[PDB]
Design a protein around this ligand. Sequence first.
Ligand SMILES: [Mg+2]
Ligand SMILES: [Mg+2]
Ligand SMILES: [Mg+2]
Ligand SMILES: [Mg+2]
Ligand SMILES: [Mg+2]
Ligand SMILES: [Mg+2]
Ligand SMILES: [Mg+2]
Ligand SMILES: [Mg+2]
Ligand SMILES: [Mg+2]
Ligand SMILES: [Mg+2]
Ligand SMILES: [Mg+2]
Ligand SMILES: [Mg+2]
Ligand SMILES: [Mg+2]
Ligand SMILES: [Mg+2]
Ligand SMILES: [Mg+2]
Ligand SMILES: [Mg+2]
Ligand SMILES: [Mg+2]
Ligand SMILES: [Mg+2]
Ligand SMILES: [Mg+2]
Ligand SMILES: [Mg+2]
Ligand SMILES: [Mg+2]
Ligand SMILES: [Mg+2]
Ligand SMILES: [Mg+2]
Ligand SMILES: [Mg+2]
Ligand SMILES: [Mg+2]
Ligand SMILES: [Mg+2]
Ligand SMILES: [Mg+2]
Ligand SMILES: [Mg+2]
Ligand SMILES: [Mg+2]
Ligand SMILES: [Mg+2]
Ligand SMILES: [Mg+2]
Ligand SMILES: [Mg+2]
Ligand SMILES: [Mg+2]
Ligand SMILES: [Mg+2]
Ligand SMILES: [Mg+2]
Ligand SMILES: [Mg+2]
Ligand SMILES: [Mg+2]
Ligand SMILES: [Mg+2]
Ligand SMILES: [Mg+2]
Ligand SMILES: [Mg+2]
Ligand SMILES: [Mg+2]
Ligand SMILES: [Mg+2]
Ligand SMILES: [Zn+2]
Lengths: 116, 181, 23, 69, 83, 97
Amino acid sequence: ARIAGVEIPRNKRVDVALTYIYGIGKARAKEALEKTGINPATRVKDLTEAEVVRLREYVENTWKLEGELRAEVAANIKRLMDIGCYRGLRHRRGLPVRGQRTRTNARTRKGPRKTV
Amino acid sequence: PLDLALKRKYYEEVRPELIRRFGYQNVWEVPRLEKVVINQGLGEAKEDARILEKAAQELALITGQKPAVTRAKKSISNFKLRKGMPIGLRVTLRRDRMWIFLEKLLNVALPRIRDFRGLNPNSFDGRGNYNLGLREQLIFPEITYDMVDALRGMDIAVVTTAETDEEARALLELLGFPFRK
Amino acid sequence: GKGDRRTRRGKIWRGTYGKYRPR
Amino acid sequence: MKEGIHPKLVPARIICGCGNVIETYSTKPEIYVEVCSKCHPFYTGQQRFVDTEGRVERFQRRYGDSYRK
Amino acid sequence: PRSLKKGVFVDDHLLEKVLELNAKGEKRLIKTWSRRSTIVPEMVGHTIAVYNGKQHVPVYITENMVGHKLGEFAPTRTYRGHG
Amino acid sequence: TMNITSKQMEITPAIRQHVADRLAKLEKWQTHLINPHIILSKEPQGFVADATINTPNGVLVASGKHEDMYTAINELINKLERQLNKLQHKGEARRAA
RNA sequence: GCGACACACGUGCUACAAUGCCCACUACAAAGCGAUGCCACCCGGCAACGGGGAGCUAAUCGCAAAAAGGUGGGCCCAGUUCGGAUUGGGGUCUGCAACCCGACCCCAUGAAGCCGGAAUCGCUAGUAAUCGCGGAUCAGCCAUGCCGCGGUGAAUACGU
RNA sequence: UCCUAAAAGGUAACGGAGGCGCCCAAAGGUCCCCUCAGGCGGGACGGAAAUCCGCCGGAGAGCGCAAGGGUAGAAGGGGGC
Ligand SMILES: [Mg+2]
Ligand SMILES: [Mg+2]
Ligand SMILES: [Mg+2]
Ligand SMILES: [Mg+2]
Ligand SMILES: [Mg+2]
Ligand SMILES: [Mg+2]
Ligand SMILES: [Mg+2]
Ligand SMILES: [Mg+2]
Ligand SMILES: [Mg+2]
Ligand SMILES: [Mg+2]
Ligand SMILES: [Mg+2]
Ligand SMILES: [Mg+2]
Ligand SMILES: [Mg+2]
Ligand SMILES: [Mg+2]
Ligand SMILES: [Mg+2]
Ligand SMILES: [Mg+2]
Ligand SMILES: [Mg+2]
Ligand SMILES: [Mg+2]
Ligand SMILES: [Mg+2]
Ligand SMILES: [Mg+2]
Ligand SMILES: [Mg+2]
Ligand SMILES: [Mg+2]
Ligand SMILES: [Mg+2]
Ligand SMILES: [Mg+2]
Ligand SMILES: [Mg+2]
Ligand SMILES: [Mg+2]
Ligand SMILES: [Mg+2]
Ligand SMILES: [Mg+2]
Ligand SMILES: [Mg+2]
Ligand SMILES: [Mg+2]
Ligand SMILES: [Mg+2]
Ligand SMILES: [Mg+2]
Ligand SMILES: [Mg+2]
Ligand SMILES: [Mg+2]
Ligand SMILES: [Mg+2]
Ligand SMILES: [Mg+2]
Ligand SMILES: [Mg+2]
Ligand SMILES: [Mg+2]
Ligand SMILES: [Mg+2]
Ligand SMILES: [Mg+2]
Ligand SMILES: [Mg+2]
Ligand SMILES: [Mg+2]
Ligand SMILES: [Zn+2]
């Protein structure tokens, strides 16, 4: 688990393998490769260990990643379900939160269909 | 015996701090480290590929000591367990090897743990011994991501000559054990 | 692709502009 | 000990990413690691990597104090 | 959400009853039809009855529920499930 | 599955089951009934029961009218049975020459 | 409240990828709409947008960019640089007011889905398929709808 | 094998309860080494119960199999020849 607590896929480009980190999309990928001046097309299996610790230190010290990101999102839902707001109720029962239709579809929040 | 940073740190900085903090009358009365037994509970290699020599090889690389096998004292239905079936590993580390492994554990292993927030303070025996667990073996430096096939944690039991959990926690935290509370 | 908000093709489908489809 | 069954322990250099070198003994004389106890956030005081925020919710809004009173 | 260029919206007539209770001393129960009004820090501690089309649900305002609206805590649908 | 519709009327889940049990008579032929839709209503004369079912060998359309609600359901089943019994045997007629 | 959600049916949108996805550059339409309207152009911002401000009762000026396509570069068969659902946080605008219950922008999350059972729909030439644009209603918009417009442009008909 | 059986042995009933018609090539000989069940506490997946550590624990475990007797100062667990 080199960076940043997970292992990034080698033989892939660094701007791509960095997305395999819970908290880094294509945006924060092109960001960490300019702040360190590291060629985004170069493969992970071809990185310099000097370029590793530089990209490591910048990424791990700029955005919350991995378990620390999962804690606040869980805590943000935790307070939503504790205060008792309408969005908290949708998380407690498990229904959609963002004004979506529930008569049909809505299958991602409910899961596969339950026959009756 | 070999000259080690952790054993020297014990004899130099941990002994007098302990004697001062507790007021021991005799040199032997001070808490000392007795042994460190590591045990891979395994049991996943009952049937299937019972060839667990990859795990024993990993333990022999991490500790520098070849482990021994542990088998079942009885047959168990629900666990799919026949009596006398090899189900685990156990290596007993003492003296210089104990110091070496504890050095590498405190300086490299415990840091590299995913979402590490310290060692559980209430994990003490009551008699003055400590225990902990590990979810992976990639935590140790001698184990890389290539030579591994499956994730397998382990149990670590540190046995101390201390009599209370107080003196034991003193000795262990002084030696550098990071406690979350 | 036409449903992906973070792409050129996706904002043509929607009819809006942004960083991925400037004007 | 039993000869021929134990990997030999030899003087070992354990190099960390932050530049920390550790003189020890192991089966591989050189081992590089991503993190060590001298640079982990939980060890080095309270080096909260990115998030030393302060929650910051909820009274930390204060945008703004313009409603009449 | 509402624009930062515009202000934090309270129905004025509701904020009046808030400040009148902060001077002489909190608190007395307030009935309101202001689901649109945003909770303000000066509302923390009081007990506001929010109307949900039928009932006036008593809702105690705390420290963690300041950035929300009053209508989020007096829901409008009685739903116990199916079956 | 099976769908029932009460047009400008109000029926109970008990009555909805009776319609489901009367449609078991079509299961006799051991052929696939594809989304049998049932429509009930109230004329001035009496109740009316419609049904539009698809089978792998065609579709079934019928109508039953009677003063008694369940009796119109019966007539609908009688007329559905007949159509079903024809769609499963009309091919067997011209096997020779 | 008409926006409910143990479920069921119809119509659609977007997909399951290399005859493809993404980035940069560059060509070719028609029909409409536009005076607290359409906004050129400048500037702030990653952006939505905001602040300036010329023109146009409009074959004059504006919406406006057409998209597929063309050129170049990347991706290399993976639940992936396919797919963009769901959720966390931060903003913009309309509007008295976006909690229930608006659209949009941005960071993060990155699901089902590997071409679909029984059954069934459309289409005979500029047609199907695929690609984009405008308008009514309209403060805004849940429009993937409807009514129109063109771009590329097939297969097949022995026979009843 | 136990009870009935009346503290030596023996003792009947269509009296009360159970087992046998096998097995083991080590489950045999010998030398050397080791000590249980259980309870409490601690320990990744791991649980009432898998394996690990500590403390208490004379035998309640074990001894192929019914029952009784015997048994760790071994008849129990392991190895050598
Ligand atoms: Mg990521
Ligand atoms: Mg000494
Ligand atoms: Mg304790
Ligand atoms: Mg002790
Ligand atoms: Mg390692
Ligand atoms: Mg397409
Ligand atoms: Mg995508
Ligand atoms: Mg020797
Ligand atoms: Mg029905
Ligand atoms: Mg009804
Ligand atoms: Mg009705
Ligand atoms: Mg009819
Ligand atoms: Mg009949
Ligand atoms: Mg309403
Ligand atoms: Mg809704
Ligand atoms: Mg149903
Ligand atoms: Mg269906
Ligand atoms: Mg649609
Ligand atoms: Mg594929
Ligand atoms: Mg995935
Ligand atoms: Mg799948
Ligand atoms: Mg993807
Ligand atoms: Mg296709
Ligand atoms: Mg078919
Ligand atoms: Mg025709
Ligand atoms: Mg349109
Ligand atoms: Mg218009
Ligand atoms: Mg409009
Ligand atoms: Mg919506
Ligand atoms: Mg006797
Ligand atoms: Mg006797
Ligand atoms: Mg006798
Ligand atoms: Mg005798
Ligand atoms: Mg033997
Ligand atoms: Mg024997
Ligand atoms: Mg025990
Ligand atoms: Mg557990
Ligand atoms: Mg346990
Ligand atoms: Mg016994
Ligand atoms: Mg023996
Ligand atoms: Mg022997
Ligand atoms: Mg011999
Ligand atoms: Zn370090």
